[PDB]
């Protein structure tokens, strides 16, 4: 089995959601220590932002590319091609303004690509990005699980539901901003529901 | 009065919203010939992404800022200041990949800053950006309104609520893909709505 981690905090070794994706690398080594684990951290090294000329390179008209442009398709195929061979799919996707960070947000937008992850049928959309299972590790400062105010949790459902991945798990940490004991508890929690994945 | 024009389409003069727009600023300047217009060009005039560098600037510590940090800072006050010196704020807000454009995004993360645009209380979180009326001019490939793939309209009246922008009237432009004659319905209807919001 292959998983692929996705990491999308700007606050590098103090990220919680980078020190959950850590537990979560650690604990599969142990338990299945056959399987390849490919980390990618999309803050160390980022995504460019999808901008008019990016776009020009996803959704192509009939002209010559730029270099920027084909180097923007180069590494969307990439980013496309490493997605599809993995198995396990592990998401990192802190909480920022009520939304997830621009550094996954630009990831997803050179990963959407019609006929090579998704495509438009007479019966709606069908996603290209088949058998794969999902976690997504989700920290915030405040408690939004099941309110109104979490519109990650949907959006990252609907997303990679679009692409194919239905198969979606959540782990939270909340309430991390409310002190060092309910991050620890926060943390604790996760770390036990991570646990129950690992061992199933 | 002053109105606020944000655009935020990678389309340039082929965006649905930013024609939409126009046609708001232009039924404005006729209806209400002594405001002052403002409009924020989002792609044209990109804002930076949100990064570790960056909000170290907007959440800073007990250092020195780099020159970079200090630019960062000065284009921070520089959009809030804007946004609280105009009375109608007019957001141009297309949907890509089930979100906002990182155009838009980029924007919301330096105008969310503690202490500026919000505070924290023991009651919860109460925004610093009163008085204002904005409009939400929303445009889609697809129709989303009122179903469960629709994570932008919340997500807007969540953002504009948290800074206090609590009064927000929603036009939508849905079905463009569809074709020229749904788009053109699109842009009728939505003509329509904004023809009611300014003449009110
Ligand atoms: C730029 C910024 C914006 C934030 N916005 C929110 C917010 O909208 N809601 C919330 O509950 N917490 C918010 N937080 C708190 C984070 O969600 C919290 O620190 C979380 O642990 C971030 O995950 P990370 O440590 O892996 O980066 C924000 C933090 C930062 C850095
Ligand atoms: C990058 C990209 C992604 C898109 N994703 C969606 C989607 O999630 N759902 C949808 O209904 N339309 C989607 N569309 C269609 C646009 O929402 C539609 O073209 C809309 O008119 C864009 O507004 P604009 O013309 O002002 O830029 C997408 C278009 C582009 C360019």
Avoid: C
């Avoid at 980022?46 to 390179?57: H, K, M, N, S, T």
């Avoid at 630009?106 to 794969?132: C, I, M, Q, S």
């Avoid at 309910?182 to 929690?189: E, F, I, N, T, V």
């Amino acid at each position: 089995s292959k998983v692929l981690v996705l990491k999308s905090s700007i606050l590098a070794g103090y990220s919680q959601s980078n020190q959950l994706s850590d537990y979560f690398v650690e604990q599969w080594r142990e338990k299945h220590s056959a399987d390849e684990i490919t980390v990618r951290d999309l803050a160390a090294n980022p995504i460019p932002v999808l901008d008019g000329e990016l776009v020009g390179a996803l959704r192509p008209s009939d002209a010559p590319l730029t270099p920027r442009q084909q180097e923007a398709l180069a590494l969307s195929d990439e980013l496309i091609a490493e997605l599809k061979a993995h198995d396990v799919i592990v998401i990192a996707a802190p909480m920022y303004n009520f939304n997830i960070s621009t550094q996954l947000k630009n990831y997803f937008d050179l990963v959407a690509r019609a006929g090579v992850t998704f495509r438009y049928t007479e019966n709606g959309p069908e996603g290209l990005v088949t058998g794969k299972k999902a976690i997504v590790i989700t920290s915030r400062g405040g408690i939004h699980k099941d309110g109104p105010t979490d519109l990650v949790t949907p959006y990252l459902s609907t997303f990679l539901g679009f692409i194919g991945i239905t198969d979606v798990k959540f782990v939270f940490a909340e309430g991390i901003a409310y002190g060092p004991e309910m991050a620890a508890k926060a943390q604790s929690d996760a770390k036990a529901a991570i646990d129950s994945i690992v061992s199933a």
